[PDB]
Amino acid sequence: PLQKTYNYNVLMVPKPQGPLPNTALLSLVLMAGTFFFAMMLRKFKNSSYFPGKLRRVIGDFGVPISILIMVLVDFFIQDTYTQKLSVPDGF
Amino acid sequence: HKVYVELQELVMDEKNQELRWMEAARWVQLEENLGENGAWGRPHLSHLTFWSLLELRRVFTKGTVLLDLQETSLAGVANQLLDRFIFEDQIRPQDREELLRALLLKHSHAGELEALGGVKPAVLTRSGDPSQPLLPQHSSLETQLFCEHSPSGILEKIPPDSEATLVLVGRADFLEQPVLGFVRLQEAAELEAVELPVPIRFLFVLLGPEAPHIDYTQLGRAAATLMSERVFRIDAYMAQSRGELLHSLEGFLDCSLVLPPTDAPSEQALLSLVPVQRELLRRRYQSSPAKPDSSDDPLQQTGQLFGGLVRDIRRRYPYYLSDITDAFSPQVLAAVIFIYFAALSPAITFGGLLGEKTRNQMGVSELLISTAVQGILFALLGAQPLLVVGFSGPLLVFEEAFFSFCETNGLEYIVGRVWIGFWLILLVVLVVAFEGSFLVRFISRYTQEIFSFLISLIFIYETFSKLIKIFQDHPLQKTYNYNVLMVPKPQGPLPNTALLSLVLMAGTFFFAMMLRKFKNSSYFPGKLRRVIGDFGVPISILIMVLVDFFIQDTYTQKLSVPDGFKVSNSSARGWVIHPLGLRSEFPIWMMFASALPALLVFILIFLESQITTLIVSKPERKMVKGSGFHLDLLLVVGMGGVAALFGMPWLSATTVRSVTHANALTVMGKAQIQEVKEQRISGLLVAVLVGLSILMEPILSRIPLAVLFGIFLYMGVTSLSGIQLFDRILLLFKPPKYHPDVPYVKRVKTWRMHLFTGIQIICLAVLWVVKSTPASLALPFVLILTVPLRRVLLPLIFRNVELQCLDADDAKAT
Amino acid sequence: HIDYTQLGRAAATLMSERVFRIDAYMAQSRGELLHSLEGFLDCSLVLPPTDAPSEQALLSLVPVQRELLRRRYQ
Question: What does changing residue 488 to S do (chain B)?
């Protein structure tokens, strides 16, 4: 939640215990940014702005480009915590 | 001179199955028709169709004509006209027993119909019972467009001395061919089918069975518009036989003008059909003894002293009552609510910056008072009441430079501004005396587009810079300190401020974009849809203010205004400044040399205001009432000087605020710019609100600062529409296959337009670099140096037709 | 009641239309042409001699013509 003060000797090894400062809003920011980029590339696919070959090539790769952009954006931010993907160790 | 024409058909009522006569339209110089509601549509010009006139000619070639018959009642008319149709063998004698009762039926108006319930078309049969038509029917064109108080205006338009005509149209299955009767009475007669007290002279009867390419309503419309013309009516008043009517009918058809259906209709190519209709009018009135009824520059050098001021006053001030009255729409209220915040926020920002920059010699309250007074006076006495006065950036830069100079040389500051204001007053009086504003003529579209594009770009850049500053003040860290006192200003970073601000900005922009597009959709009833779409910005602001109000523990920067109408620094300043000296007396040489900065301030203010008035009042934005240049310049500069007398700052016309105001007060058609509401109430109310803003602490203290960033971005994006350099820059990327159909695409090759755009972009870049250079005050000069570039250098590279097609002075005509 | 130049102009305005020339390409007898001419003339508007201001009179026609041109293409 959005509070006035948090505890900062929280161990987040198994899972984040207690609230955290910037997770809730950064997550929303990332979702809205990814959605906006996907929609904008989807609309650019149908536009008439670039040469047809490169235009269609760029428009067909909209979702992976937006995913890569947002992954890099999250990679540049260091101190804020955001939930990540995790898979089992072995078969 | 002016006559009344009535048309009634024989139809059936929804109440009970029957037949009776109901009127369908009326003609006094115009057509008025009614729908199913019983309400009469707004009068309009009558438009003919091919089959109506053609079949009218065909039936008129074989029509019985009875001239000056002496009757006053309807039954004797019926008897004599049916004897006439028997006489010339137009109908069989075994039909008369039907047709008599066809005629002797009731004739009711619209007021009876609501109790009746409404009517629908029906056909006479041989029996005497209504019946449905066999051939299919289509919805009428005039009722769909026009129908989907009045009688007082009908009796007002009609002169008291007039006579009327009536036409009775109907379908009857027991006939062979359509028949026509045309009777002119001996004397005027009152008839019980017409409730109006006017008498009747002429009478038509148009009957027939059903046939293809014949619509009896359209035929009646043709007959009525035939009767309404002045010359044919005069001929019928003097007609003595049938061939006279035939020749007059041929003269009527000869001076008719028919236009066919096309592929893509337009208005601009259609305006070239004015003179040929006039010549047909003249050739039509060539045959008539009667005669038909219907047969300046804002900037200009005049040979008189002060000519421009008087010209603009005489041109504008006659519209004052309309300017007062046109403010009663709610769109004006929405525009007021928008521009209030749009003008209040930069006022506060510049006030705080100037107070912290000049050691609080001038602050927020003085700027607020100046904005209020200089808005009120300009809205009350102005020639163009759509301008928005306020503080700018270059004025702040000049204040910075002058304060640095006065700190270095060792003189006072608020005292020298008084002499600067005096010199400004003298200079503007001298300039207005010699009408030296005609030089605005030389500023072409080039500089206007460059200036507007640069201004909007700087606006967006500064907005994003503000956001990045907010992000810089409260970074994203792993731990914060929480025994922090936030009473004077937030010390240290905060957890959720930086991201909540961004969320609010994006939310305001996104909601604004959701409502602006819904305004143009087709999703709700038109009235409520337009009402909701016109209030988009205040609705989004209210929603987000409530959303922020629900969140309790997170901190967000809010709006804050001074406590009362007090001076910024009460230690060294007063409400009035003594010109001779505040603390130490002022030197003489500075008194005489203060003219040098006054010239630069005058150049800045003049350039900005005149370019703003040029951009705002272009012919393309459907601006009806005239706009004045000399009066606005005189008012602005003189009032700026008088405000500089009191130590308060001078103001100038703003580009983005004025363009946003003008765009907000525009009613658009389903797109085409239908019209633009020009009035003086909006600016006056905005100024009064900015003045009283200091008394609205509890409401304003709850509006977060991050919401207005979304509105600023929305404003910056919307103000970017009309720029043509922006369109030509967008065309730099599209392949030449998708280029639009404007003249500058077809007339010139592509790689020449690209060269033009590149030159203009280089000019933009040079202006930007000079703006970043510490020699920023030399920005206006460089700008006017783009004017010679257009006059000399470009004709050395391009050709004349390319230059006329690209740099076009009018948008519609190129 | 015959002027050959205006009759030729009317023929040219016939030939410049889309749907009429499409029917002329699809024509195989005189009946189809007569039917297409009937359909073309069914969607015209005639202007009587009026003393109104000419620009306002000409600008009042626009939505009527738009509705007629929507009806013709059906």
Answer: In BOW antigen
